[PDB]
Amino acid sequence: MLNKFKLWVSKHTDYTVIHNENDLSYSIIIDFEDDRYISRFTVWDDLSCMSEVMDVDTGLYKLNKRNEFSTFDELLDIFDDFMISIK
Amino acid sequence: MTATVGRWMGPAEYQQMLDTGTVVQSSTGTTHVAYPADIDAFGKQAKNGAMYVEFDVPEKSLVPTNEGWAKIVGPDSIEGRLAKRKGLPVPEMPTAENITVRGEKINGEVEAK
Ligand SMILES: NC(=O)c1ccc[n+]([C@@H]2O[C@H](COP(=O)([O-])OP(=O)(O)OC[C@H]3O[C@@H](n4cnc5c(N)ncnc54)[C@H](O)[C@@H]3O)[C@@H](O)[C@H]2O)c1
Ligand SMILES: [Zn+2]
């Protein structure tokens, strides 16, 4: 999943992808931060992902969801929610 | 004010955790753990060679869920990045007491060690 996601993000987006390589796991994280939101999208090679969007003013999460998927289409629809959640 | 958690981790993380007696921060920025500690909760997706380690952390360093897992609040967690921005004390990775290996992932199945 990770490699086609990397390519999708590179093609449709300006967000910077960070790759984490560990002995047992590959993962991708996308950190974004601006005036109103501190946010991160994490996706793992085990077909799961995490969507975090914290509202700076209130200090409460706007989006805080862990998702297990099984399809690249499912991943994109989840990431779409995360994207829409910022701007 | 202590709580028992479980985490499937690789040899390198376990070694670091044991050498420092401190929870290792995931390279994702947030270390996830099972709460309550459960060997089967996240064993299915744990890779071969992983070890299921149970340890005790302070309750104040956990953010639990209704789905059997919890976040450990470290410097690079979302809560940690908020604290930095607001000018509040940035939370460090908590201590890990009573570190015990309770399982291993071998040949695609959850072994109990
Ligand atoms: N690991 C668990 O037992 C656990 C607990 C509850 C939920 N989950 C869920 O499982 C999925 C994957 O989580 P995860 O914990 O496997 O991801 P992770 O990225 O935190 O860890 C993946 C692998 O990388 C290793 N690793 C990560 N950071 C490291 C570092 N700094 N130094 C050394 N080794 C390091 C870990 O030991 C593990 O083998 C997520 O959806 C998560 O919510 C995991
Ligand atoms: Zn397209």
Report the 3 state secondary structure along A32-66. Answer: EECCCEEEEEEEECCCEEEEEEEECCCCCEEEEEE
Q: For residue B57, which of B24, B86, B83, B28 has the smallest C-alpha distance?
A: B24
Burial of B29 (0-12, 13-18, 19+ CB in 10 A): buried
Q: For residue B110, which of B40, B5, B10 has the smallest C-alpha distance?
A: B40
Query: Is the Cα torsion angle B44, B47, B48, B52 positive or negative in sign?
Result: negative
Q: For residue A62, which of B35, B29, B85, B82 has the smallest C-alpha distance?
A: B82
CA distance A15 to B94: 31
The pair of three-digit structure tokens given for residue B109, joined into one six-digit string = 């199945």
Q: Are B5 and B37 in contact (CB under 8 A)?
A: yes
- Say whether A19 counts as a known binding-site residue: no
The single-letter DSSP state of residue B61 is G
CA distance A54 to A73: 26
- Say whether A36 counts as a known binding-site residue: no
Placement of tokens 């093609």 in the chain: A11
Q: Are strands A61-68 and A18-21 parallel, antiparallel or unpaired?
A: unpaired
Q: What residues in chain A have their Cβ under 8 A from chain B's Cβ atoms?
A: 20, 22-25, 27, 29, 31, 33, 38-40, 42, 46-48, 50, 52, 54, 56, 59, 61, 66
- What is the domain extent for residue A71? 2-86
B99 φ, ψ (degrees, to nearest 5): -75, 120
User: Distance, in angstroms, between A8 CA and closest chain B CA?
Assistant: 20
State the virtual CA torsion across B7, B11, B14, B18 in degrees, nearest 10. Answer: 160
Determine the topology of domain B2-107 in CATH: ADP-ribosylation fold (3.20.170)
The pair of three-digit structure tokens given for residue B112, joined into one six-digit string = 């109990």
The pair of three-digit structure tokens given for residue B66, joined into one six-digit string = 């209704």
List Cα–Cα distances, B89 to A40, A53, B52, B82, in angstroms: 21, 21, 32, 10
Is B77 in a helix, a strand, or coil?
coil
The total domain count for chain A is 1
Is B20 in a helix, a strand, or coil?
helix
